[PDB]
Design a protein around this ligand. Sequence first.
Ligand SMILES: NC(=O)[C@H]1CCCN(C(=O)C[C@@H]2CSCCS2)C1
Ligand SMILES: [Zn+2]
Length: 140
Amino acid sequence: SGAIYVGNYRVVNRHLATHNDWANLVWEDSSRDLLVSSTTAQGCDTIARCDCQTGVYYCSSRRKHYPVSFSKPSLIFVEASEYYPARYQSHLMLAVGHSEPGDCGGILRCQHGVVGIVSTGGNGLVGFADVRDLLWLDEE
Ligand SMILES: NC(=O)[C@H]1CCCN(C(=O)C[C@@H]2CSCCS2)C1
Ligand SMILES: [Zn+2]
């Protein structure tokens, strides 16, 4: 589990969104595994607007933050899970690292801010849904 709290937005994995998220919906995209809902309180996370391909992510199944090198956002094929069939996911970045279902939602960050959240896993890989192109998260 986990979310990004930027401004009056909450960014979560679409497959983990709650009823309150759906009832306060701003934007969702199944191809990216992302959903954004509105919040009453202002958040403290800042979104990275950069070209970093190294950073650190939080792994809940280890209670640890790990440094990683990750690929550029791309269209990748992901195996079936409890939430989606096997398919292509867009704006996904892969790295070598530990990731269980329960680890989705952990933040990937660099010195500039939040880069994305854990969205896929297995066999020593971790995949992150990028948020750096969603410029509108910084306004309204
Ligand atoms: N975004 C998706 O299509 C994923 C939906 C949840 C399941 N999924 C995985 O890759 C399983 C990994 C287990 S390792 C922990 C992180 S998820 C596919
Ligand atoms: Zn950066």
